[PDB]
Amino acid sequence: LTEDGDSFLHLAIIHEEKALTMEVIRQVKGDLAFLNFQNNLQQTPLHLAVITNQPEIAEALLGAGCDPELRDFRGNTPLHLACEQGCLASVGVLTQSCTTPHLHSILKATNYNGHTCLHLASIHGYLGIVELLVSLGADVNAQEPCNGRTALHLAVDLQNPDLVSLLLKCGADVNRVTYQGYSPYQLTWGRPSTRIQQQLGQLTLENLQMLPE
Amino acid sequence: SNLKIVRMDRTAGCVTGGEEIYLLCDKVQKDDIQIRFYEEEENGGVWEGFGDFSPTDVHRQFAIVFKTPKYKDINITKPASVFVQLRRKSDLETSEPKPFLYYPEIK
Amino acid sequence: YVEIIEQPKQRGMRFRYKCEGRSAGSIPGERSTDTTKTHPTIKINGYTGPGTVRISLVTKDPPHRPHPHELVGKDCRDGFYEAELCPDRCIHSFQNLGIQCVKKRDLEQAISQRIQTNNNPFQVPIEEQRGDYDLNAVRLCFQVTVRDPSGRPLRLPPVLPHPIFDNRAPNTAELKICRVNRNSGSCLGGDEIFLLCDKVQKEDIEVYFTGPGWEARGSFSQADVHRQVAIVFRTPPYADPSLQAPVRVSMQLRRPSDRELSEPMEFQYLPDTDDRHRIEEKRKRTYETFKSIMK
């Protein structure tokens, strides 16, 4: 309603007037039209809540029944943001509350850069969120759209031996290949980490070396 | 002989089209190749759009730089998923579909 | 048949002469790091018993004839290596191997001792060696002999590896960045870039960034080199994480073997801004418009 497309609720949270917010979302009941109002950056009150690390306000917005699946200008659902920022509380609220099978959908959705929640969590090093997302039902072998990479590939790409270990501990398939036909192991050539190359040399012999010609 | 899209710098785009994309692929010939965007419709027909580019945008036979076609409805408010594929002109053979996401224009 | 697992390092090899310090070293693998030095390795596919391997030097280009140069070293004779496949594995690692040269005037002499012992791996007309040779390029021919069903010797057609060049004559390969899908990104690094180029070797190429007292490599896997004609890499983090204004830096293809560079492509590092900062810039720029609404 304001200038940047923001409503009073948006401001209620943006300036961290929890009190006001707690109330606005209380005085104004179950009205989606306003609870799912998106601004010019296509953010909803829920998005702003988690971006500004206010779990409860988000927990409230959800309680009042807002939509957990609306995407921001980057194609992100609030959970995506929660995982991208590493806020473990927000993650909890956004996954504990809507226990609805909508979770499966969210965990399945990628943003405009082709990234799922697990992917965003893995891109930064939030192993705790990564492992939580997996026990919640996110598919560790989910492939990214641009090249068909799995969290495991990204792990090699990010040279993060701890992420690698976690993913293998979660049953990640070391022989899943990218669209170029490559295994995580095969992305190690040219990269410095020998630790990673050790953690992975338990994948098909036919998926270890590059090719010539 | 086989057509394959092995990589794209981006797989989502604005419905308004015109956005530039880098695509890596198996061997193709600059004058016998096209990038077809398509979406199955209710009535069984199909909406299709073609990536815009010139054979000189086909790089050393293994990548194509091109711009996205405009989606059939630049008003949608929710993203619309479609398919993208390489298609050879001489035999109309095509690569396996890749999934492409068209998001609303935020105006 | 036989394949090649650890190709010979085809870049950065000094063809030793009649006397280059008595000896020298061993021709390294296609991935022989200065850390864990490996060597060429073939794999006899479909046979793990007694046999023999012939390491000969043929010519790079299509004519493929016994090259003037002479493979010297352990278990080597008239310009070739002759040893037997130990009856166990098929992961034969030809350790030490060397390369001597045949001066511009000892061709017809080298070609003679090349037919008297006749190396002809392809058996091409021995009467076509009246031609000239490229003394700076040589391929390694692999000739293995195994037992057939009965127990007799078995052919096994020859197999050539990536040509090995000398560190004398310069490198013709042109280094050129033709297109880049993005020329600006966060000073924090990590942005993915598609760069289209002319032919490069995935194992002998790097995306070299340079700026004011700064230089860094753009990281990528060798598998990210698509058909030696495109590279997908990520931008390295800039020298300054708290950039306040754009910084123009250069980006260019660099070939480690001879240190050569392509002309530069400009790249601008930008100050980093996430949604948080953005939201904050929006917060402090809204006290008034909001306090107004509050009442």
From Swiss-Prot, chain A:
Q: What induces it?
A: Induced in adherent monocytes.
How is the protein altered post-translationally, as described in the entry?
Answer: Phosphorylation at positions 32 and 36 is prerequisite to recognition by the SCF(FBXW11) and SCF(BTRC) complexes, leading to polyubiquitination and subsequent degradation. Ubiquitin chain elongation is then performed by CDC34 in cooperation with the SCF(FBXW11) E3 ligase complex, building ubiquitin chains from the UBE2D3-primed NFKBIA-linked ubiquitin. The resulting polyubiquitination leads to protein degradation. Deubiquitinated by USP38, leading to NF-kappa-B inhibition.
Q: In its UniProt entry, what is this protein called? A: NF-kappa-B inhibitor alpha
Q: Which disease is it linked to?
A: Ectodermal dysplasia and immunodeficiency 2: A form of ectoderma dysplasia, a heterogeneous group of disorders due to abnormal development of two or more ectodermal structures. This form of ectodermal dysplasia is associated with decreased production of pro-inflammatory cytokines and certain interferons, rendering patients susceptible to infection. EDAID2 inheritance is autosomal dominant.
- Motif annotated as Nuclear import signal, chain positions: 41-51
PTM sites of type (3S)-3-hydroxyasparagine? N141, N175
Q: What does this protein do?
A: Inhibits the activity of dimeric NF-kappa-B/REL complexes by trapping REL (RELA/p65 and NFKB1/p50) dimers in the cytoplasm by masking their nuclear localization signals. On cellular stimulation by immune and pro-inflammatory responses, becomes phosphorylated promoting ubiquitination and degradation, enabling the dimeric RELA to translocate to the nucleus and activate transcription.
User: Per the annotation, which location comes first and is thus the protein's main one?
Assistant: cytoplasm
As recorded in Swiss-Prot or TrEMBL, the protein's gene is named NFKBIA
Which family does the UniProt entry place this protein in? Belongs to the NF-kappa-B inhibitor family.
One Gene Ontology molecular-function label: NF-kappaB binding
Can you say where in the cell this protein is located?
A: Cytoplasm; Nucleus
What do the Gene Ontology cellular component annotations say? cytoplasm; cytosol; I-kappaB/NF-kappaB complex; nucleoplasm; nucleus; plasma membrane
Organism encoding this protein: Homo sapiens
The residue intervals holding the ANK repeats read: 4-34, 41-70, 74-103, 113-142, 147-176
From Swiss-Prot, chain B:
What is known about what this protein does?
Constitutes the active form, which associates with RELA/p65 to form the NF-kappa-B p65-p50 complex to form a transcription factor. Together with RELA/p65, binds to the kappa-B consensus sequence 5'-GGRNNYYCC-3', located in the enhancer region of genes involved in immune response and acute phase reactions.
Gene (UniProt): NFKB1
Full protein: residues contained: 248 to 354 of 968
Q: Where does it live in the cell?
A: Nucleus; Cytoplasm
Glycyl lysine isopeptide (Lys-Gly) (interchain with G-Cter in SUMO2) crosslink - at what positions?
K78
Protein's recorded name: Nuclear factor NF-kappa-B p50 subunit
Phosphoserine modifications at: S90
Source species, domain of life: Eukaryota
From Swiss-Prot, chain C:
Mark the residues carrying the PTM N6-methyllysine: K291
Q: How does it assemble?
A: Component of the NF-kappa-B p65-p50 complex. Component of the NF-kappa-B p65-c-Rel complex. Homodimer; component of the NF-kappa-B p65-p65 complex. Component of the NF-kappa-B p65-p52 complex. May interact with ETHE1. Binds TLE5 and TLE1. Interacts with TP53BP2. Binds to and is phosphorylated by the activated form of either RPS6KA4 or RPS6KA5. Interacts with ING4 and this interaction may be indirect. Interacts with CARM1, USP48 and UNC5CL. Interacts with IRAK1BP1. Interacts with NFKBID. Interacts with NFKBIA. Interacts with GSK3B. Interacts with NFKBIB. Interacts with NFKBIE.
Modified sites of kind Cysteine persulfide: C19
> Where does this polypeptide localize?
Nucleus; Cytoplasm
Say where the cross-link Glycyl lysine isopeptide (Lys-Gly) (interchain with G-Cter in SUMO3) occurs: K18, K103, K104
Residue positions, PTM N6-acetyllysine = K103, K104, K199, K202, K291
- What task does this protein carry out? NF-kappa-B is a pleiotropic transcription factor present in almost all cell types and is the endpoint of a series of signal transduction events that are initiated by a vast array of stimuli related to many biological processes such as inflammation, immunity, differentiation, cell growth, tumorigenesis and apoptosis. NF-kappa-B is a homo- or heterodimeric complex formed by the Rel-like domain-containing proteins RELA/p65, RELB, NFKB1/p105, NFKB1/p50, REL and NFKB2/p52. The heterodimeric RELA-NFKB1 complex appears to be most abundant one.
One GO cellular component, as annotated: glutamatergic synapse
Q: Is Ribosomal protein given among the entry's keywords? A: no
- The gene for this chain is RELA
Q: Which residues carry this modification: Phosphoserine?
A: S257, S262, S292
UniProt organism field: Homo sapiens (Human)
> What are the recorded Gene Ontology BP terms?
animal organ morphogenesis; antiviral innate immune response; canonical NF-kappaB signal transduction; cellular defense response; cellular response to angiotensin; cellular response to hepatocyte growth factor stimulus; cellular response to hydrogen peroxide; cellular response to interleukin-1
A GO molecular-function descriptor: DNA-binding transcription factor binding
Q: Where is this motif: Nuclear localization signal?
A: 282-285
Q: What is this protein called?
A: Transcription factor p65
Which residues of the intact protein are shown? 20 to 314 of 551
